[PDB]
Amino acid sequence: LYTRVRTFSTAIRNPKTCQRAGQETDLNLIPAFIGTDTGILINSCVRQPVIATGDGIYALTYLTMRGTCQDHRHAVRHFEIGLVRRDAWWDPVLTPIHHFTEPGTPVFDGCSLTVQNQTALALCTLTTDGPETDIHNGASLGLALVHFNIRGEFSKHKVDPRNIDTQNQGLHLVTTAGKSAVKKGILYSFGYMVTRSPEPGDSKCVTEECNQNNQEKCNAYSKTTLDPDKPRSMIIFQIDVGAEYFTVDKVVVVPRTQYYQLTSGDLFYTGEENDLLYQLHNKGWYNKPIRGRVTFDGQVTLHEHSRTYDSLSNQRACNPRLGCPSTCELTSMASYFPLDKDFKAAVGVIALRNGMTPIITYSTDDWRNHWKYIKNADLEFSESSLSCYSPNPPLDDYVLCTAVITAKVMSNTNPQLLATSWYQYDKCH
Amino acid sequence: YTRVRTFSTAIRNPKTCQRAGQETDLNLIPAFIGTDTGILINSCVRQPVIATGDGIYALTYLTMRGTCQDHRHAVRHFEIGLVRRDAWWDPVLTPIHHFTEPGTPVFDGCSLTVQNQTALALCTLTTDGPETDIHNGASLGLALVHFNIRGEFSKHKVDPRNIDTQNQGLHLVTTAGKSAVKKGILYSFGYMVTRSPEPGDSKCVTEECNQNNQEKCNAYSKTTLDPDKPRSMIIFQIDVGAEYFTVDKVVVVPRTQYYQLTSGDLFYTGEENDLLYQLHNKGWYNKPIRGRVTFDGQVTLHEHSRTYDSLSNQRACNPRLGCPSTCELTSMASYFPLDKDFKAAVGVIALRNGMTPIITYSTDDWRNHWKYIKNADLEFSESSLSCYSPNPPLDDYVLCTAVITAKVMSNTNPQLLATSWYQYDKCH
Numbered sequence: 001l002y003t004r005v006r007t008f009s010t011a012i013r014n015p016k017t018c019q020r021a022g023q024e025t026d027l028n029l030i031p032a033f034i035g036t037d038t039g040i041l042i043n044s045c046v047r048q049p050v051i052a053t054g055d056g057i058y059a060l061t062y063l064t065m066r067g068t069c070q071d072h073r074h075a076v077r078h079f080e081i082g083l084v085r086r087d088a089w090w091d092p093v094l095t096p097i098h099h100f101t102e103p104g105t106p107v108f109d110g111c112s113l114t115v116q117n118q119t120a121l122a123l124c125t126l127t128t129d130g131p132e133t134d135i136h137n138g139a140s141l142g143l144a145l146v147h148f149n150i151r152g153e154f155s156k157h158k159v160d161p162r163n164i165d166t167q168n169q170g171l172h173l174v175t176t177a178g179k180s181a182v183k184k185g186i187l188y189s190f191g192y193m194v195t196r197s198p199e200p201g202d203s204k205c206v207t208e209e210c211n212q213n214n215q216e217k218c219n220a221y222s223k224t225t226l227d228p229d230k231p232r233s234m235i236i237f238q239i240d241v242g243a244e245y246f247t248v249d250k251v252v253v254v255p256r257t258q259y260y261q262l263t264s265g266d267l268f269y270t271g272e273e274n275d276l277l278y279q280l281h282n283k284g285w286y287n288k289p290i291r292g293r294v295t296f297d298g299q300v301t302l303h304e305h306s307r308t309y310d311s312l313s314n315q316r317a318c319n320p321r322l323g324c325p326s327t328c329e330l331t332s333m334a335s336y337f338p339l340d341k342d343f344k345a346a347v348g349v350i351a352l353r354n355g356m357t358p359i360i361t362y363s364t365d366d367w368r369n370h371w372k373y374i375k376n377a378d379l380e381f382s383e384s385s386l387s388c389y390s391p392n393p394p395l396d397d398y399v400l401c402t403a404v405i406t407a408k409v410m411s412n413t414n415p416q417l418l419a420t421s422w423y424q425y426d427k428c429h
Numbered sequence: 430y431t432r433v434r435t436f437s438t439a440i441r442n443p444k445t446c447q448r449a450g451q452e453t454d455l456n457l458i459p460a461f462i463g464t465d466t467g468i469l470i471n472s473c474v475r476q477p478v479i480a481t482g483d484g485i486y487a488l489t490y491l492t493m494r495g496t497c498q499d500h501r502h503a504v505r506h507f508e509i510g511l512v513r514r515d516a517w518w519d520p521v522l523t524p525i526h527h528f529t530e531p532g533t534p535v536f537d538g539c540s541l542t543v544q545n546q547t548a549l550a551l552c553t554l555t556t557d558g559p560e561t562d563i564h565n566g567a568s569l570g571l572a573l574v575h576f577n578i579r580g581e582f583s584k585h586k587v588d589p590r591n592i593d594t595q596n597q598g599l600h601l602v603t604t605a606g607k608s609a610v611k612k613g614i615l616y617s618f619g620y621m622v623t624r625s626p627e628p629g630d631s632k633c634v635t636e637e638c639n640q641n642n643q644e645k646c647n648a649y650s651k652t653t654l655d656p657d658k659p660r661s662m663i664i665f666q667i668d669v670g671a672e673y674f675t676v677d678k679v680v681v682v683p684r685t686q687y688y689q690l691t692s693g694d695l696f697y698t699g700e701e702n703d704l705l706y707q708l709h710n711k712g713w714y715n716k717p718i719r720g721r722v723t724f725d726g727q728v729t730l731h732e733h734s735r736t737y738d739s740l741s742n743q744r745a746c747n748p749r750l751g752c753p754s755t756c757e758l759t760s761m762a763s764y765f766p767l768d769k770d771f772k773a774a775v776g777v778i779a780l781r782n783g784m785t786p787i788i789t790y791s792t793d794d795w796r797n798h799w800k801y802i803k804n805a806d807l808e809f810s811e812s813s814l815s816c817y818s819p820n821p822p823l824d825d826y827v828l829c830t831a832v833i834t835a836k837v838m839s840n841t842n843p844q845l846l847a848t849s850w851y852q853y854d855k856c857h
């Protein structure tokens with residue numbers, strides 16, 4: 001059988017109160033030989049990467065298309081599960097053991113991903129041309145729960161979205177790509193919901209001096225409508241995947257007061273009795289990290305942390321500048337992962353400047369301890385997913401992180417899948 | 430498992446019609462196989478071998494951090510998967526199970542073939558690589574590796590004491606390439622360190638090179654390790670399920686049959702047909718080296734007269750490539766038979782300067798056409814190529830998949846890339 005290398009998420013740990021030191025030496029990057037070839041030679045497009053780790057196990061998912069990024073009809077959904085194994089340097093590295101593909105059509109879109117014990121769980125949307133195009137065309141959408149385990153078993157189960165409690169407001173339910181979390185047998189994941197009535201209230205905005213009515217621009221570009229007749233709200237799905245008592249599958253609205261533009265995100269497990277953490281993905285005009293704590297009692301609140309030490313940018317400036325509400329959209333996102341259950345310390349993968357040059361950033365509160373290169377080159381990347389994990393028993397000064405990015409390799413106009421891991425400094429003083 | 434049934438193009442009768450060059454552009458399709466191999470960290474991938482069976486493929490390769498000369502810390506990868514219809518209804522390769530064996534010792538020089546639902550690899554167990562181990566006075570092991578589409582994996586040490594060498598073998602080494610199974614016997618290339626030097630001249634050329642070619646051919650033939658260690662090319666014969674009693678053995682490929690000691694591929698053509706072969710261009714000889722293998726009376730490599738493809742380096746050699754020298758091609762060529770005679774062939778080769786991977790398509794000694802894998806200044810080092818027909822076959826095409834080790838984004842080491850294509854196969 002396989003020997004297990006025990007690991008756990010850094011996000012379940014108590015925060016360190018000591019000053020976290022910047023690492024003086026350069027990064028020890030180590031192999032993450034996961035995923036597949038994704039068509040660097042033929043300029044294929046990889047979208048929606050999500051990585052998740054458990055106890056000696058990781059899982060990975062992504063969507064591939066030939067030639068363009070706008071061909072959902074002929075896309076292929078990839079799923080993968082693998083192990084943490086000691087290599088010839090005795091480093092714990094990720095390596096795949098089973099891979100699965102599901103070609104369209106319909107295709108699995110916007111899959112979330114988590115690892116529970118020996119099983120990966122993905123909640124996905126069944127679509128022909130992509131959810132927004134299907135909804136516009138008057139088509140319906142499906143949902144699916146996919147699981148696969150380290151034995152190589154694979155299951156896909158349709159979930160009737162009409163039987164999910166939406167307080168009779170939901171017309172369409174859509175999952176979006178990112179990390180999910182399971183607490184007390186309930187699977188939580190981000191998505192959005194087309195509703196009968198528009199959601200009242202102002203979208204979250206900024207008081208930055210932008211030579212305009214910010215709140216007006218914020219509402220206008222909030223992406224809370226798919227059409228004059230199609231309002232949509234951000235949601236968190238709650239699916240019973242093993243609750244102690246019977247629970248009704250439901251969605252809960254994330255009110256538009258809680259975010260700037262409707263977007264995807266990650267939910268980070270911190271323990272059975274601890275609040276989930278979150279990050280929203282910078283895919284619009286807001287160019288600072290969007291992360292913090294989620295609570296549900298009475299209503300869904302995104303308790304957003306005050307974070308300014310990292311800034312996202314595009315190669316070409318926007319008018320008004322990024323950070324000001326506009327129709328500009330960041331071409332390159334950032335992934336953050338909590339080093340503790342409060343998100344006090346964070347690891348990030350982000351572009352250095354101009355939407356290129358992947359770097360790792362390392363913060364405590366609103367202070368950047370250091371940054372290091374993944375690759376000091378003019379390499380653009382579009383999407384990312386990041387997971388950090390500690391061996392058990394832990395190392396004194398380090399944890400481990402793995403990132404997947406979709407990068408425009410060798411002057412390709414589309415992005416392909418690349419991966420890397422590193423020893424992540426975790427040390428006091 | 431649900432899969433597109435396939436068979437190797439090398440078992441077919443040669444087409445009696447004239448083969449046309451393809452006027453239309455190449456239809457390249459995804460080969461999303463293997464893993465990330467450290468493009469971001471300049472890892473080194475070596476010894477790639479791909480093999481196909483009936484709706485099944487297998488892949489193997491060796492990875493190292495930072496340099497290509499770190500056998501002590503290398504990792505051997507094995508992979509098996511299926512031929513499946515994608516959303517365009519094209520038959521594409523997709524992995525189902527992956528395996529790694531980190532050093533040390535590591536599996537070096539693995540050959541690879543697919544027998545029914547099981548991949549077979551014959552490998553050499555080594556610490557610092559076979560030549561370094563031999564130089565250091567260490568011994569080597571052999572191993573037979575099996576892994577199947579259900580995900581089962583087996584490795585068994587093979588004691589060289591059970592391999593008949595007519596009491597001449599001192600070390601046995603497998604080299605990376607395609608193997609073949611006929612009538613339950615596994616055949617694969619390798620080399621053998623012997624007690625006594627092999628007599629005879631190395632195969633040579635008569636090209637005017639302003640030198641004594643035969644003397645240079647013998648001197649640069651790589652038939653000696655160190656100063657006192659002669660070695661001979663061999664073909665292993667290992668029982669993997671023969672119906673009759675056989676002794677596992679090596680058979681010498683005499684030095685008259687090849688230019689420099691090197692690795693190669695053996696191509697199955699049917700239970701009752703001669704194997705085909707190719708030797709890998711890793712030295713000064715810069716034309717294809719391929720043809721038919723026979724065994725009745727020790728190994729004869731019946732080398733075809735092939736000149737339509739020529740390999741080149743970015744920096745010229747003095748004397749020029751094609752002339753015996755100590756210069757070595759930085760990029761190899763992979764060929765695959767489209768029939769049991771190797772009459773028609775698919776090739777993967779660099780266009781010029783050891784870069785720009787292209788596909789060539791030949792009949793006899795004529796290049797019908799060539800097509801780009803990538804029209805870019807992309808250096809690549811090693812390759813493996815397999816072509817296969819869906820069953821029932823297509824009228825005008827077959828399918829091919831290649832893996833190459835390419836120096837991506839100004840990396841000094843090469844990483845694993847893959848692609849497939851519809852290969853023109855049409856008459857007139």
Ligand SMILES: *[C@@H]1O[C@H](CO)[C@@H](O)[C@H](O)[C@H]1NC(C)=O
Nearest residue numbers: 116117118119149150151242
């Ligand atoms: C973890 O998974 C294994 C295999 O699926 C199962 O047998 C075991 O009971 C699980 N343990 C828990 C605590 O759920």
